Every structure is written in structure tokens, then in C-alpha cells.
Design a protein around this nucleic acid. Structure first.
Ligand SMILES: [Mg+2]
Ligand SMILES: [Mg+2]
Length: 958
RNA sequence: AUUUCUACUGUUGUAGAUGAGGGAUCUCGCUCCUGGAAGAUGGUGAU
RNA sequence: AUCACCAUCUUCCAGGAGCGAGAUCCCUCCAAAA
RNA sequence: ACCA
């Protein structure tokens, strides 16, 4: 479909020849080397109008509710300060320069601080409830005496603990500390955090005010920082091409004036295996700065002339008429003065801009940029030394790994673009791929943690890196988002959604997000929907013509020895067994050997679904088992974090102890865990005798026990973290228990239990069972959270969570291209709209959920094709899910969202039936998922796609 | 062994992904500095 | 036997700054002729 | 919707 301009930041390496922190920044265009700060006059005068507040309108900035007395008290407290003619602001901003101003955020902080100061003194000193009710602490007043006593019991207990600790000796001191920290201080803090209603409400109100202020604080901070970021340009840059390779020349502005003049006299003499390029261009965004930029001061010499062309002054004169603006700009280019100082190609502009007529301003911008962008070329004998002599030019070599290897046709995309920029054909499209006129250089020190311990390596020595920005699709409409109001982004999305047409779409992808399979994919086409069921079943059965072809590894332990005697395993890197050259080179085998190995090790089949947990693209084939290590790394990082966050990390020693286990031993531990898993309601109501049968139900094999209807009545309704915890489960679980007593006798105070790891089958192909030794070294009580630095422990889960998404986006894009080059039309990506309420629950249950990251990476992927609009504030548009509506659909470009109700069990053909088991509908229709889907778990994704398609077309009917 | 990340890894390096810099608000874990309160212990003064 | 004070010491609370993890968010990345 |  029709695209729009897109930007990316690509970088290379530089090798110095003649001479992180910004060592240098440069601009190819010679006329942006003396920049001046942007004209933000409007926004500065507009944001002050949002800062100012009128006292009486404060309480309507929040959803919270305060009684009238508290409202009056707060207003009185603020008025106490607003005397002497001060004016109130939503916050303090030293950059705008306001004075005699009073910050509301500071006052809200102070009235909270003073009261939390007085309340502690009152509670500590030993006053009474009636004394409290007579104080001026209007926030803490009116608490139930029950809470007051609940708090003072802990206070006095703590008091006791204090003097106990002072006269301490020996290991006793360790058992005291924990009892002081773990149970008393934390419980007391939570009591006041989550039970004092007015306190909670005021905390929420202050939070909302603080966030609101922070927004328009960040905006203004960026506005100010732009004023100083734009003074660091000093160099004019050139690219000297030779023998098919580029150099990089930086020349200071002290000499650019003479250097360009000298270069202008060079003779263009074809190709001699050496060229000295230099860029020139003008843009619409710069003409407005030229004409209506800083006009109020009157020193804009471009407005000492040209005024006759004006209607009165200032860009606001045009009132917003596109065709008056177009004509004024054409006249500006038509003026005698403008052509005397500008450097545009007068002939082509005159024959193609001034004389023409444009339908809209977008085309005027496109034509101006298209015709004003030039890439010159000159050549002369040994043209390197004159620069070093006359102009003191610094010189680097631009390089990278892909720019030095023998074979080509297999090269990284970010190098593909740079290779494609210089092609001759690209000069005849008017530079569709554009290299923007500003670039930067950075210098990185070596890692001492690598030097000391140490075989080529990046980090073993310093590096010079070049960062450049490249704009693809330079001849399509532009789109920018700075300073748009929140209500304009939604309108932008709605307008951009109009491009799609009802009969344009031809298929859809449905994606399901579980927790045993982190995600699942399925494909739907309109051809599946025949009239009779007998036709639907047959249409589905033709898997050979619809589904896609996938390879499955047959033996994950297979290994082979290469010529060096080293051994290699298939699981770690299958790409050394699928590609031909790699196998024949490394293992020195013959053609027949390769054919036999390929025919014996890998199975292949065509299906309608998949399982994105481990699928990967290897040498053009989709391997369903090509990415086990990336899943193991995630299931290991989750456990390593969990077993480190349940310790304690105070400086002073403590006796908290924790251990790993395969099963729980003492009934205290089982009773603690069962409580950790169940809902507080329907559990505390559970009889103290049945709390043992519940443990037997959770932790035994369920085969030798005669559990009655109680299981459905009670056990299955109070469980909120589902799973299988038996000893013979498919993926046996591995536990961590925490206590203090030395030997864990049958009567000990265990005060935490959790389930850490899942022993997924086929993890043993990488690591033996004993490699829980790895899961432990990352837990240690003595460690202080402040001390722990990177490169000795790593708690990050972001990278290991982006790895799986990186492997899944490849599969999804490959399938999208495959089907689009067969059906002739674009398709929709459908996933259910959980919103924000359920995303947090999903994170809680596992903490490695991939939903939001996968969505945020699909948006990044599919923008390049021009299929979703630019995104500014994602939470603005949705902020929530789609519930209780089985027809609605939320659309961002080609990415849809729907309600997930009743999708995971309905039969694709019979609808009314339910298909939780046997892979055949109980209604006895012809449906049978044996030869279609990888398992019975894919039926959700299919449905997720199905409902995604039918609804979308339904939206276009009117 | 990489502009950068992940799995490998040296007879041409291999398979997937890649928009980077600086900053704002909030939640959780910790440390140093200054101030307030409760209190343990040796000593000194006093009625 | 009681009351005031000096000094070492324990805990909790408030404010300032810094480190580690997660969530939401923002701006910059093309201008000038004497 | 997440799951012996
Ligand atoms: Mg689902
Ligand atoms: Mg699922």
C-alpha cells in the first residue's frame, strides 16, 4: 500500500588516520553548520496557560472524593500561603521565569509530611484515642479505634525490640534483627498504607497532581534543552570514495569556506576509481524558518526584503488557506532577491515548480524536497593531500564486518540499505533512499572486566562508532507528531484507518497468548466458509493447499564431530546442519551423506497452526525446535530473580535462610504454600480439618485417594494460580522454602514458600539435572542491593524477553510475505484486547509474559511496509480491553483487537459444540483436528482469526 | 569472533532481529548526610 | 532513696542526594549570506 | 481468558 517517510538510525565503525562522549558531531549540508535554536514561541506562551490554576478548580483535577470539611481545610491551608498577592501554579518551573508564584505540588507534599511527622510523635509518646480525635491532623483523624490499637501494639512491640537489641550478644543478635525487620516494621507500614482510607485517597490525589505536573515539566525541559543542543556543530563532512570503499573527511568551519571554493573549480572527469562527493539540499521545513523565523525582533534580514509579497506580517496572516500559502511561497522563489542568495537548480525549479499547480501542500513539499536534493561528484588525481595540507582535514575509514567479507548475497539489512544508497539506479529515482545531513561520532573505552580476565573481541580495545540517520520512502507523505494534543492522535488513527478497503483484505492471522505455550499462531481465509457443514469439513481438510510447511527435529541429542576433533550438537545451532555449504565444509562429508542426514534427521509437514515458543527461521525453513535455548534462558532468569528477591539485603547481618527442594517435607510448608496459592475468600472459610484434605488434593497423585464432590464444590473454586504440583506431572516443579530455624523440625516457623522452576522436558539436552547449581549462585542474603553492580550479577529480564519476540517476528513476517505473494492482498493481524487490567494479572502469574512486548514489536515491524500509523501514546487510544461485545473490533492500521470470550473451546465447524478433549466434536460432526493443527490447543488461534475477519468486514458494510 | 542483541564460534564466520541520544513521573530493594522522638548503660551534680 | 545533667549506645520517623529492577511518558535528529 |  501507499507508504510514508520513515527514519532509522544505522551505525558503522570508524578507523582514525589523521588527527559515549560526543567526540564530534557534523553536518554534510554546508548551510546548517551555523544553526540557530528553533522558534518555540507559541508553545512557551501556550503552556503557561495550562500551568496556572484558579484555586477553586483544584478538586476537579482528580477522581477522588473528599468530604467538605477536608476540602475546606485544604483550601484554607493553601490560602494561608497565597497571601501577599502570590499566584498559584500546578507546579514550580524555573525555566519559564515566573516569580511571586506558589507551587501546589509543594504544598500538597508539605501538609502530608507535617502530619506524618506529628502522628508518629503522638503514637510513640503514648497518648490516647480520645486525645488523637482532638488534634488538628484532619487526614489521620477519624480512623477506627480498631486500627489505632492495631498500630500501637506493633509500635510498643518494636519499642521493646529496640532495647532488646541494644544489650545483645552472640548469634542471638541475628534472630532479633529479622524479627524486628521482616514482620514488625513491614506489617506496621502496610497497615497505614492500605487501610487508612483518607490517607490512601490523599496519596492518590497527590500522585495524580504530581504526574500531571511532571508531564508539562518534561515538555518544557526538552524545549529548553533544544536551545543548547544546537550549538555543537562545527564540521563540514565529505565522503571520498575509492576502489569501491568510502572514507570520511571532517573539515572545520574555519576552513570550509575556502575548501568549498577550491572544490568548486575541480573538473568532473567521469570515473577514475576516486571521487569526492558533497551534498546540497533545501527543504520546506527550512523555508518557514527563513521567512517567518524570529520576525518579531525585526532582525530577520530575509524580511527586510520580500515584504511586498506579504498580504500585516506573520505566518498567521494566511488564516490557514493552503492555496494562498502555496502561491506566496512560489512568489518567494520567484522574487529576484531570493534567487540571488539561494542555491537551488533554478532551471528545473522554474520549469517544474513555479509554473506548475499543486493540489495540496503535501505535494508542494514533496516536489521541493525531491528537486532540491543533489549529490555532486568531482574527481582529480591524488585528491587527498591538499585537504590535509590546506585545511587540516581529519580522516577516518568507514568500515564494518559485512563491508569486508568475501562472499555476498547474505548481508545484514542495515548494511543492505547503505549498499543500496550508492547504486546508480537510485540516482534516477530522485534519491528515494535519503541520507539526512546530520551525523555523529562516539568513542567507547574498553571494558576493564574483560581486559583483566583476558581471541578477537570488540570490548578488549577502544572503538570509534559512527551514528547516521537514513530516511526511506523520501517521496511519500511525511508525518510528525511533536506537540500533538492527546485528542488529535485518536483522530489521526481514525483517518489513517480509512485507506483499507473491504475487498482489499484476503486473509487474517490470529494469535493466542497462554502460559504453557507463550503464544500460538493460526491463519484464516474466507474460502473456509461454505454453506453446509459437509462442505466446511472438506474445505478444511485440504491442508495440502492452504497450510504452510514446517520442519521438526527428530532427535535433539544428535551430535557429530568436525575435522578439528571438536564435537557439535544439533540443539545448540541447527544452522550448521541445514545449510549445505556449512555441513560439507565443517564435517567434510559428501553429497550423498548430506542427503541421507537431511532425510533421516528432519521431519516435515504442512499445518494450519504453529507454536511460537520455539519456532525459528533457519536457512529459509521454519524449524519448530530451533530455539529451545532462548526459552531456557527466560525460564532461568525468572527463577534467578525470584530466588533473589525473596531474601533480605540490609547491611547489618540477619539469619534468614532459604533452600531449594524437589518437594515439601513438613506440613507447615504445605499449609503455607496452599495458602500462597488460594484466594483469601473461600479459603479462610475452609474448615481447619479440611485444610489437610486440600493439601492432599494439591500435592498427591489423585489416583489412590477417594476425593468426593468437594473438589468442585470447594477446592476448584478457591484456587487462583493454576498448575500441576504432583510429583509425576508433565513438567515437575522445583520449590524454594524460607525459614530461620537450623534443622527444620516438625514444629518450626516457616513464613514463606514459593514455586520457582518448571522442569520442562528436553531441557536436559542442554543441562543436566544438577545444574540447579546455576539457579542458586544468584541468591545470597549477605549481598547489599546498593553494592551489587552489573557484570557480576545480572537481574535484567528485558533482553532475554526480547529474544523470543525477535525469533517470533521473523516467523510472522515470513508467513505474511509467503501468503501475500500468493493471494495478492494484504491481511490483518488479530489478537485479543485484554487491556490493562489483565496484563498485570498475567505478569503476576508468570512474570515473563510476552503480550505487551510482542505487540510493541509488531508495531515496529509493520510500520516499514506502511501498514500502521505512527504511534505517540499507546495508552491514550485503548487503556483497556474489549469486553462483553462479541462484534466490536479495535483497529490500528492492519492490527485488530477483539473480545476473547468463548473462543478456546468452541468447535470451528459446529460452533455450538465444545471441544476440550479428543480432538473431535462431541456432536459427532465431521470435524477432526488430527491432520490439521499441531494440537488441540491451536483451536483458539483459529477462532481468534475467524472472529477477527468477519467483524472487520462487518464494520465496512456501513 | 558482531554498528548492537541472542544461540554458536574460527579453512571464506554462520541463523534470526535491529531508531539512537538525553530526560520526566510513579512503584519496589538499599546506602550516606542533616533534623525530631522513645529508651538502654557508665559517670557527675542535688534534695 | 529520688531528681537534674554530661557521654557512649539501640529502634522508628521526616527531608536531601545517589545506586539496582519494572511500568507509563516526552523532545531532538535540514539553514544562513557578507 | 490463564490450568491435571
Ligand atoms: Mg487466548
Ligand atoms: Mg494458550
Amino acid at each position: 500500500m501507499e507508504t510514508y517517510k520513515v527514519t532509522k538510525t544505522i551505525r558503522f565503525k570508524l578507523e582514525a588516520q589523521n588527527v559515549g562522549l560526543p567526540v564530534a558531531k557534523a553536518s554534510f549540508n554546508y548551510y546548517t553548520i551555523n544553526k540557530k535554536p528553533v522558534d518555540f514561541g507559541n508553545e512557551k506562551s501556550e503552556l503557561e496557560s495550562r500551568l496556572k490554576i484558579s484555586i477553586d478548580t483544584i478538586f476537579k483535577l482528580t477522581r477522588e472524593n473528599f468530604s467538605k470539611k477536608i476540602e475546606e481545610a485544604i483550601t484554607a491551608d493553601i490560602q494561608k500561603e497565597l497571601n501577599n498577592g502570590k499566584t498559584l501554579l500546578l507546579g514550580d518551573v524555573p525555566m519559564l521565569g515566573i516569580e511571586n508564584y506558589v507551587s501546589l505540588r509543594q504544598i500538597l507534599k508539605n501538609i502530608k509530611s507535617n502530619q506524618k511527622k506529628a502522628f508518629s510523635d503522638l503514637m510513640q509518646s503514648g497518648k490516647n484515642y480520645n486525645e488523637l480525635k482532638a488534634t488538628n491532623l484532619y487526614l489521620l483523624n477519624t480512623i477506627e479505634q480498631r486500627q489505632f490499637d492495631n498500630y500501637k501494639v506493633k509500635t510498643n512491640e518494636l519499642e521493646k525490640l529496640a532495647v532488646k537489641i541494644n544489650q545483645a550478644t552472640n548469634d542471638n543478635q541475628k534472630k532479633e534483627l529479622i524479627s524486628n525487620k521482616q514482620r514488625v516494621a513491614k506489617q506496621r507500614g502496610i497497615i497505614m498504607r492500605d487501610n487508612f482510607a483518607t490517607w490512601k485517597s490523599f496519596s492518590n490525589f497527590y500522585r495524580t497532581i504530581s504526574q500531571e505536573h511532571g508531564k508539562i515539566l518534561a515538555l518544557l525541559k526538552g524545549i529548553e534543552k533544544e536551545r543548547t543542543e544546537s550549538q555543537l556543530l562545527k564540521y563540514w563532512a565529505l565522503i571520498l570514495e575509492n576502489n569501491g570503499q568510502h572514507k570520511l573527511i571532517l573539515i572545520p568551519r574555519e576552513k570550509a569556506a575556502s575548501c568549498k571554493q577550491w572544490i568548486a573549480s575541480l573538473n568532473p572527469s567521469g570515473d577514475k576509481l576516486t571521487k569526492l562527493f558533497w551534498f546540497e539540499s533545501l527543504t520546506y521545513r527550512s523555508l518557514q524558518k527563513l521567512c517567518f523565523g524570529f520576525t518579531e525582533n525585526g532582525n530577520n534580514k530575509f524580511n527586510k526584503n520580500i515584504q511586498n509579497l506579504l498580504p500585516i506580517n506573520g505566518e498567521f496572516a494566511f488564516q490557514g488557506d493552503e492555496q494562498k500559502k502555496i502561491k506566496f511561497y512560489q512568489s518567494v522563489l520567484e522574487s529576484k532577491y531570493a534567487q540571488s542568495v539561494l542555491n537551488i537548480p533554478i532551471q528545473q525549479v522554474q520549469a517544474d515548480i513555479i509554473n506548475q499547480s499543486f493540489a495540496s501542500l503535501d505535494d508542494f513539499q514533496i516536489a521541493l524536497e525531491k528537486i532540491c536534493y543533489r549529490l555532486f561528484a568531482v574527481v582529480e588525481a591524488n585528491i587527498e593531500a591538499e585537504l590535509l595540507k590546506n585545511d587540516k582535514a581529519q580522516i577516518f575509514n568507514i568500515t564494518s564486518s559485512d563491508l569486508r567479507k568475501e562472499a555476498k548475497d547474505k548481508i545484514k539489512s542495515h548494511t543492505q540499505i547503505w549498499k543500496a544508497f550508492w547504486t546508480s539506479e537510485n540516482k534516477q529515482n530522485n534519491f528515494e533512499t535519503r541520507l539526512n545531513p546530520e551525523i555523529t561520532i562516539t568513542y567507547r573505552q574498553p571494558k576493564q572486566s574483560k581486559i583483566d580476565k583476558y581471541k578477537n573481541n570488540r570490548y578488549l580495545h577502544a572503538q570509534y562508532t559512527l551514528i547516521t540517520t537514513i530516511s526511506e520512502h523520501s517521496n511519500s507523505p511525511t508525518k510528525i507528531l511533536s506537540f500533538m494534543s492527546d485528542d488529535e492522535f485518536k483522530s489521526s488513527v481514525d483517518t489513517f484507518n480509512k485507506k483499507f478497503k473491504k475487498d482489499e483484505i484476503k486473509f487474517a492471522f490470529g494469535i493466542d497468548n497462554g502460559e504453557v505455550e507463550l503464544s500460538t499462531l493460526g491463519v484464516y481465509f474466507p474460502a473456509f466458509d461454505k454453506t453446509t457443514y459437509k462442505e466446511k469439513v472438506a474445505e478444511l481438510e485440504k491442508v495440502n493447499d492452504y497450510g504452510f510447511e514446517v520442519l521438526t527435529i527428530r532427535n535433539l541429542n544428535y551430535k557429530e564431530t568436525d575435522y578439528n576433533g571438536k564435537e557439535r550438537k544439533i540443539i545448540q545451532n541447527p544452522s550448521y546442519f541445514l545449510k549445505k555449504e556449512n555441513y560439507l565444509r565443517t564435517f567434510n562429508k559428501s553429497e550423498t551423506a548430506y542427503q541421507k542426514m537431511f532425510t533421516e534427521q528432519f521431519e516435515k509437514k504442512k499445518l494450519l497452526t504453529l507454536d511460537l515458543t520455539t519456532a525459528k527461521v533457519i536457512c529459509g525453513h521454519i524449524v519448530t525446535n530451533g530455539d529451545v535455548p532462548a526459552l531456557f534462558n527466560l525460564w532461568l532468569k525468572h527463577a534467578q530473580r525470584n530466588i533473589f528477591e525473596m531474601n533480605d539485603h540490609i547491611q547489618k547481618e540477619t539469619a534468614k535462610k532459604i533452600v531449594l527442594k524437589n518437594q515439601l517435607d513438613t506440613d507447615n510448608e504445605k499449609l503455607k504454600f496452599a495458602e500462597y496459592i488460594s484466594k483469601e475468600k473461600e479459603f479462610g472459610k475452609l474448615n481447619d480439618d479440611e485444610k489437610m484434605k486440600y493439601t492432599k488434593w494439591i500435592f498427591e497423585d489423585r489416583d489412590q485417594n477417594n476425593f468426593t464432590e468437594v473438589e468442585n464444590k470447594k477446592f476448584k473454586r478457591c484456587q487462583k494460580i493454576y498448575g500441576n504440583y504432583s510429583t509425576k506431572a508433565k513438567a515437575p516443579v522445583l520449590f524454594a522454602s524460607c525459614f530461620i530455624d537450623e534443622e527444620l523440625q516438625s514444629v518450626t516457623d516457616i513464613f514463606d514458600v514459593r514455586h520457582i522452576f518448571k522442569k520442562r522436558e528436553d531441557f536436559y539436552a542442554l543441562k543436566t539435572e544438577e545444574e540447579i547449581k546455576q539457579l542458586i549462585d544468584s541468591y545470597n542474603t549477605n549481598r547489599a542491593s546498593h553494592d551489587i553492580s552489573n557484570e557480576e550479577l545480572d537481574l535484567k529480564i528485558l533482553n532475554t524477553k526480547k529474544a523470543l519476540v525477535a525469533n517470533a517476528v521473523g516467523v510472522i513476517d515470513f508467513l505474511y510475505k509467503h501468503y501475500e505473494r500468493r493471494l495478492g492482498g494484504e491481511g490483518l493481524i488479530i489478537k485479543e484486547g485484554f487491556g490493562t487490567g489483565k496484563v498485570e494479572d498475567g505478569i503476576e502469574k508468570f512474570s515473563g509474559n510476552i503480550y505487551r512486548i510482542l505487540e510493541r514489536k509488531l508495531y515496529q515491524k509493520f510500520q516499514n511496509y506502511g501498514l500502521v500509523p505512527p504511534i505517540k501514546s499507546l495508552m491514550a487510544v485503548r487503556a483497556n480491553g474489549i469486553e462483553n461485545n462479541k462484534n466490536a473490533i479495535l483497529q490500528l492500521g492492519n492490527v485488530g483487537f477483539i473480545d476473547p470470550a468463548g473462543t478456546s473451546q468452541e468447535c470451528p465447524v459446529c460452533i455450538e459444540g465444545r471441544l476440550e478433549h479428543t480432538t473431535t466434536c462431541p456432536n459427532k460432526c465431521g470435524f477432526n483436528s488430527e491432520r490439521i493443527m499441531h494440537s488441540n490447543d491451536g483451536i483458539a488461534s483459529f477462532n481468534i482469526a475467524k472472529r477477527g475477519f468477519n467483524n472487520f468486514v462487518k464494520s465496512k458494510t456501513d
